[PDB]
Structure formats: structure tokens, C-alpha cells
């Protein structure tokens, strides 16, 4: 009955996604071994929207875990409620983007993404009929944002008539945890404008002022960084150009305008 799947990307996305499954497994009474020992009928009428049953009574989830670093996969595997995930749904790399949005988008994100679409197909084959996707990523680190931006773009293309919701995180208001955080954020918002149906930010379809403060501070740092053209050769040298960044700030200014709040020569006219 309109079954939905989940995709978890990056270091931040895995940590939150691992705890997200906690609130559903215990609410429906799913044992850590995968069995079922619940005692209610309301825990079974909707068990198929999030879990795929197996032979003998095993209920496996519908999540795909992708990352460019293999060291973040075994943390979920050995943690609580980590045995129930499908062994084939783990997709890992060997290099890592290293807070590089563009390295995880074209030069090295172009190989592992082909290893993710083949996985989302076999899961979507088993379901009766699906209605949408759920993806979780970040906006500061280039490992997740660059890979997620490509991943979120290659999902909409094959499924142009399916909804898709995101639970992205946003950078800290005053402090910044990375030097190039404004660079990694402006290039990712404009790709979520016409490719998403509902987005959420956790600290005209943006939910959580009227979000106007978040976009105002990002473009202030970005403009100051771009005026001096600082740390720009890291992105242009791998396949970008100057005009690509111009479209990011021009589009970013348009969204602020849609979010509206509501000289010494004045003699004749």
C-alpha cells in the first residue's frame, strides 16, 4: 500500500538514520534478531510500508546505506539493531571526498553512484507499488552534499513522477565548522529547488522567522569569499568554471526575494 524506501548518505546521515530505525522497530515490536513478538493488531496493518517480510517471519527494513569511507559502515553493523539490515545494501568507497563537493559530484561520484542505482532497483522490484523516496544527507561536508546532490539528481530522472522528501541538516548560525562551508551550501540548495517536493532543516516548500535568516547569512559570507576568489582553484581545476558559481548566487538571491519580509540630493525631484 504505497510502500516507501529510505536512503542514508554520509557520516552525519548514517548516525541519524541508525537512530531513526530505533523508533519504528520498538514501536512495532520488532525484535533485534528480526523476528516479531508483538501483542497488538495495530502494529501489523501497516508493517509492510516500512518492512519487507522474509520467509519464516524475518522482517528486514528498506534502507540503503552509501558512503565514500568504509570506516563508517561497521559502526552501524556492530551497534544495536544492526544485524537486521540487508547485507547487500551496504555501498562503500575507498577514497573519500574530503569536504569536496565537486570531487564527490563528477570526478569520483560518477563511479559509485552507478553502484547505488542497481541497488535501489532490486528493492523497488520487490515492493507492490511505491509512492516516493526518503533521503538523508548534509549541507556542509562535501562528502555527503556532493554525493547526495548527484544521488538526488539521478533518482528524479528515472522516476520523474514520484515524490521525494529530504531531511537535510543545515550549518550552524554563527560558528562555522569548516572553512569552505558557504561554498558547499550555495551550490547544493539551488539543486534542491526544482528536484525536491518537501525538505526539512534540523539544527517555497522549506520547513524547519520565515527561513529568511538562514539564506541571508550564507550569501553574506559567500559574496565576501567570492570577491577575493579565495580557495576557488580547488573547484575549477577539477572541471568547474567561473559561471557555475555565478548562477548559484544569482539563483540564491531570487529565493530571498520570494521570501519578502512584508542621497543628500533631494531638492526638486
Amino acid at each position: 500500500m504505497r510502500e516507501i524506501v529510505h536512503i542514508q548518505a554520509g557520516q552525519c546521515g548514517n548516525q541519524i538514520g541508525a537512530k531513526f530505525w530505533e523508533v519504528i522497530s520498538d514501536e512495532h515490536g520488532i525484535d533485534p534478531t528480526g523476528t516479531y513478538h508483538g501483542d497488538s493488531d495495530l502494529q501489523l496493518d501497516r508493517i509492510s510500508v516500512y518492512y519487507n517480510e522474509a520467509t519464516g517471519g524475518k522482517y528486514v527494513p528498506r534502507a540503503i546505506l552509501v558512503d565514500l569511507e568504509p570506516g563508517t559502515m561497521d559502526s552501524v553493523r556492530s551497534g544495536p539493531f544492526g544485524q537486521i539490515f540487508r547485507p547487500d545494501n551496504f555501498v562503500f568507497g575507498q577514497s573519500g571526498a574530503g569536504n569536496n563537493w565537486a570531487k564527490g559530484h563528477y570526478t569520483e561520484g560518477a563511479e559509485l553512484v552507478d553502484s547505488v542505482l542497481d541497488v535501489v532497483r532490486k528493492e523497488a522490484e520487490s515492493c507492490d507499488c511505491l509512492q516516493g523516496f526518503q533521503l538523508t544527507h548534509s549541507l556542509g561536508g562535501g562528502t555527503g552534499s556532493g554525493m547526495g546532490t548527484l544521488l538526488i539528481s539521478k533518482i528524479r530522472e528515472e522516476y520523474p513522477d514520484r515524490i521525494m522528501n529530504t531531511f537535510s541538516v543545515v550549518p550552524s548560525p554563527k560558528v562555522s565548522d569548516t572553512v569552505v562551508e558557504p561554498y558547499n551550501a550555495t551550490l547544493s540548495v539551488h539543486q534542491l529547488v526544482e528536484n525536491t517536493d518537501e525538505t526539512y532543516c534540523i539544527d517555497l516548500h522549506f520547513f524547519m522567522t520565515a527561513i529568511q535568516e538562514l539564506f541571508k547569512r550564507i550569501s553574506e559570507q559567500f559574496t565576501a569569499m567570492f570577491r577575493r576568489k579565495a580557495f576557488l582553484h580547488w573547484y575549477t581545476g577539477e572541471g568547474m568554471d567561473e559561471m557555475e558559481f555565478t548562477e548559484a548566487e544569482s539563483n540564491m538571491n531570487d529565493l530571498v526575494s520570494e521570501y519578502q519580509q512584508y542621497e543628500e540630493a533631494e531638492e526638486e525631484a
Binding site: P70, D74, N100, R121, K122, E125, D128, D161, T178
Partner: protein, 528 residues
């Protein structure tokens, strides 16, 4: 200088910069030299998760050993840029660079500028390439020749009982999909692996294998003659793009709206049924529907009453393999349905292996996209075989795209060694030291082969070089007796493009390394 500006910097001046690049280049070669030839030893690779990977190919090994060095990263990227172009020659790439830097250090340590050696590499690289043009032999590349070329590249990554089986499946597959014109296009040979039975059951199927079957329990499992309908249309319940909503009344109008929302999708099913009933009036043929989009349980009950085996959510690449194989047209809409757009197969049967389901398409009229079926009892065995299959397919496409083949067994590295000696006096200046050092690095392929078989490294070279002065025959090294053997009349063959790219690559990297002045790390510690 830099230490005064940034105290947290690491620098390596004067000759300390050349001592780091030489030391690490020789460190990667003492591990990569045991993988050369059919007598190399297998390696075990264990990651942090606990998986097991037994590999012998130099590209897979380099990207799995825990190595953190700046100058060991340059060599790693050179090998990657060879695997995706030529697909062979990743172990011989590391050995030559590691030895070319070793020979050039004997003259730098004697008080000689590294630029003088650089000019010698350029002259030696131009003579070696002019010598290779006259060694290659241009042949027709019939079936019997492609058996020998493919076997040389498969006998080093499996045993003899498997390479004799995998050679026939690779040579046959390339020939079946090759036309009289146009380059050979890959991505048309699906590599399917099933974890069952033994590894000697790896066969070639003249058709397609799909990793999914039918999702209804009332569908046929064996059709002896079928029409293949490849489509990319959606039979799932879909909703209007603009936000709509029903506004009904007393409970009779709710029933008039539930079956009025299924008309748009039940019209597409009724177009297929009339097409099936037209071309197959008598219950003697089948009708298989392969879709790229989903199918509702409602539409799996309408099609299963007429015996229409239907599969959903196929991969996008299979919309092109199924037209060349069968011969239909992959259509997007149903407004122009006609019998001319249907394929033809000869046997479609279902295979269930535990919890997974497979579908076989066989007996095609004139197939142009064959599939390879891999079988093995272990997870790492299916990965070891899949590496050899990739290696053997690029060794046959290279042999066809270039109408020339170079003999192997190291018989050609000896030949540049003798040619460059007589060219040494013709070069003026101190640059004769570059040619002498270049002729010493090329002789590492015979040395490693002679050392890995358990012979003497020096007593074998003098025997090989005792020939080729007294008889103009490309004599190589035997790997069972150590006697000089002629490589052109036994079956040992290499690729002309593999040796040509290797000479070009191994000289550019080792020329920039020798000119490095210092290794400076003055930037930020981490991007934070």
C-alpha cells in the same frame, strides 16, 4: 626558509627529497614483483569489516594495501589510468618505474646532475619505439590466433583447468557480437554470477539472463515459443500532477468513483490483450512482457488470466540488449501497437536458487548481445573469476582493433636491450649514460620471470643474450626448464598497444620524479 614563516611545516631540501622518492619506489616493487608471470603467488587481502579477497592483479592489490605516502600515490594513479584504457600491464608498470629510478641513482650519486640523465631517456625512448614497429607481426586475427592471445592473459590469473574453459567463452563471445564494420562495443555482454555448483560450469549463454522472475503464482514457468514485448510504459496507479481530490456524496457515488479511476490504466492492459489474441489465436505460442516500470497487483491479475508472463522493473541497459538479441522495438507508448514491434525467443524458463529468482532467454535467431554466466562455491571465487573475465575480453578487443601482435615471454625486452647498445656511441656528451641506464631497466621482465620460477637471475640472462646475436630470432625465456625458447612458435603473444602505452607512461612519470627539488607541506593540516 619556510620553517621561519610556518613552524608547523615539513620540508625536505637538497638530496633529502630524492632519497624519499627512491626509497618508496623500491618499496612498492619488492611487493609487486612476486605477481609476475603464471608462477606468481596468490595474496590474501582482509579489510576492516572482515571480508576476504584473493587477487593477483596489480591494480586491485595497490588499492587494497594500507599505504600512506605522497610519492606512492603518483604510481597508483598511473596504474589506474592503464586498467581502464588497455586493461593489462599493471604489474609491469610498477616494476619498470621502480627499476628505472634505481639505475638513474647510481649515476646521480657519483656527482652528476639529474638533468643529464633526462636527455638520455628522451633519445632512448625514440629509438625503442622505432624498434617496436618492425617487431610486430600483422595477421588476419582468425579464431585460432585469438585463442592463443586470450590464453596468455588468462593463464596467469587462474589455474590451467580454468583458463582452458574461460578461453572458449571469451573468444566466442567477442566474435558473436562483432560486425564486419564499426568498433566492438562493450556493455553488451552481461556478467551474471550465481553462487552455486562448481567453478568449471562457467558457460556462455546465447541470450540474456535476468535476475528476477514473475511475481504472480499463476504464471507459466516454461514457454516453448514466445513473443518478447519490450516496453518502458507505466502500469502503476499514478496521480495527477496538479493537486486534485474526489468530492463524493451518499455511498453509491463512492463506488462509482473507485472503478472510474482505474480506466486510464485498464486501457493500456486492454491494448496488449487484443494484440496477444490477434497474433496467437491458438494456445500454441507464448507472450512475454518485459517492462521497465512497475505493475500493480491488479494488472498482474488481468494479464495472468491469459498466460502473459510479465516482469517489472528491468534495468535500463537491458532495453538495448533485448532488441539486438530478439529483434523487436522498445516502445514508450501504446498508441501505435503493431505486430512488427515484437521480438522472438525459443525458450523462456524460470530458475529459482534459494531466495533469488532467475529468468533465461535462449534460442535466439541472430543474437548480438550474449551473456556470461559465472558459477562458483565461494563469494571471493566469483570475484577472482570476474577479474580474469574482464582481462580476457580487453585482450581480444585490442588484438582485433589493432592488426598486429607482439610476441611475449620477455623476448622483446631483450631486443631493445641489444638495439640501444649499438645506438649508445651515436649520442654525444654525457647523455650516453641515459641510454646505458635505460637499457638496464628494460631487462627486469626477464629477471623477474627467471627469479620467480626458481632459477639463477644472472646465468639465465647470459644464455638468452647468447642468442639473438648469432641468430635473428626473438627468443624468450622458458618457465619450466630455463632454456631459451622461441616465443613466436609456441603461443606466447602480447598486445602491441599495451607495450606501446607502457613505454610512454613509464618514462613521463620517472622523468618528473627525477626533477623534484623539495617536498613542501606548508598548507592547512586539514580542511576545517
Amino acid at each position: 626558509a619556510v620553517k621561519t614563516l610556518n613552524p608547523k611545516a615539513e620540508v625536505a631540501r637538497a638530496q633529502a627529497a630524492l632519497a624519499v622518492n627512491i626509497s618508496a619506489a623500491r618499496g612498492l616493487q619488492d611487493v609487486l614483483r612476486t605477481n609476475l608471470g603464471p608462477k606468481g603467488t596468490m595474496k590474501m587481502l582482509v579489510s576492516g569489516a572482515g571480508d576476504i579477497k584473493l587477487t593477483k592483479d596489480g591494480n586491485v592489490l595497490l588499492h587494497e594495501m594500507q599505504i600512506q605516502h605522497p610519492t606512492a600515490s603518483l604510481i597508483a594513479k598511473v596504474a589506474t589510468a592503464q586498467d581502464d584504457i588497455t586493461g593489462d600491464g599493471t604489474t609491469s608498470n610498477v616494476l619498470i618505474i621502480g627499476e628505472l629510478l634505481k639505475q638513474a641513482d647510481l649515476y646521480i650519486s657519483e656527482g652528476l646532475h639529474p638533468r643529464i640523465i633526462t636527455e638520455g631517456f628522451e633519445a632512448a625512448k625514440e629509438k625503442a619505439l622505432q624498434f617496436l614497429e618492425e617487431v610486430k607481426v600483422s595477421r588476419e586475427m582468425d579464431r585460432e590466433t585469438l585463442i592463443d592471445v586470450a590464453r596468455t592473459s588468462l593463464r596467469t590469473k587462474v589455474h590451467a583447468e580454468l583458463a582452458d574453459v574461460l578461453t572458449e567463452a571469451v573468444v566466442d563471445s567477442i566474435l558473436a557480437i562483432k560486425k564486419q564494420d564499426e568498433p566492438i562495443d562493450l556493455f553488451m555482454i552481461e556478467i551474471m554470477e550465481m553462487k552455486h555448483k562448481s567453478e568449471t560450469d562457467t558457460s556462455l549463454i546465447r541470450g540474456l539472463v535476468l535476475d528476477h522472475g514473475a511475481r504472480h503464482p499463476d504464471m507459466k514457468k516454461r514457454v516453448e515459443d514466445a513473443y518478447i514485448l519490450t516496453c518502458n510504459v507505466s502500469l502503476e496507479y499514478e496521480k495527477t500532477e496538479v493537486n486534485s481530490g474526489f468530492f463524493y456524496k451518499s455511498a453509491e457515488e463512492r463506488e462509482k468513483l473507485v472503478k472510474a479511476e482505474r480506466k486510464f490504466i485498464e486501457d493500456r492492459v486492454k491494448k496488449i490483450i487484443e494484440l496477444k489474441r490477434k497474433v496467437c489465436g491458438d494456445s500454441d505460442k507464448g507472450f512475454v512482457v518485459i517492462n521497465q516500470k512497475g505493475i500493480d497487483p491488479f494488472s498482474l491479475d488481468a494479464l495472468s488470466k491469459e498466460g502473459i508472463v510479465a516482469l517489472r522493473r528491468a534495468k535500463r541497459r537491458n532495453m538495448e540488449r533485448l532488441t539486438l538479441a530478439c529483434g523487436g522495438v522498445a516502445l514508450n507508448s501504446f498508441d501505435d501497437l503493431s505486430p512488427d514491434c515484437l521480438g522472438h525467443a525459443g525458450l523462456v524458463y524460470e530458475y529459482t536458487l534459494g531466495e533469488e529468482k532467475f529468468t533465461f532467454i535462449e534460442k535466439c535467431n541472430n543474437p548480438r548481445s550474449v551473456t556470461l554466466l559465472i558459477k562458483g562455491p565461494n563469494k571471493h571465487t566469483l570475484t577472482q573469476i570476474k577479474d580474469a573475465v574482464r582481462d580476457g575480453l580487453r585482450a581480444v578487443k585490442n588484438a582485433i582493433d589493432d592488426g598486429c601482435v607482439v610476441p611475449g615471454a620477455g623476448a622483446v625486452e631483450v631486443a631493445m636491450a641489444e638495439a640501444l647498445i649499438k645506438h649508445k656511441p651515436s649520442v654525444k656528451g654525457r647523455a650516453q649514460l641515459g641510454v646505458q641506464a635505460f637499457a638496464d631497466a628494460l631487462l627486469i621482465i626477464p629477471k623477474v620471470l627467471a627469479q620467480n620460477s626458481g632459477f639463477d637471475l644472472q646465468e639465465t640472462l647470459v644464455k638468452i643474450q647468447a642468442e639473438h646475436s648469432e641468430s635473428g630470432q626473438l627468443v624468450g625465456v622458458d618457465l619450466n626448464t630455463g632454456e631459451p625458447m622461441v616465443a613466436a612458435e609456441v603461443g606466447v603473444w602480447d598486445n602491441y598497444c599495451v607495450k606501446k602505452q607502457l613505454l610512454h607512461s613509464c618514462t613521463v612519470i620517472a622523468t618528473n620524479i627525477l626533477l623534484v627539488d623539495e617536498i613542501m607541506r606548508a598548507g592547512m593540516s586539514f580542511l576545517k
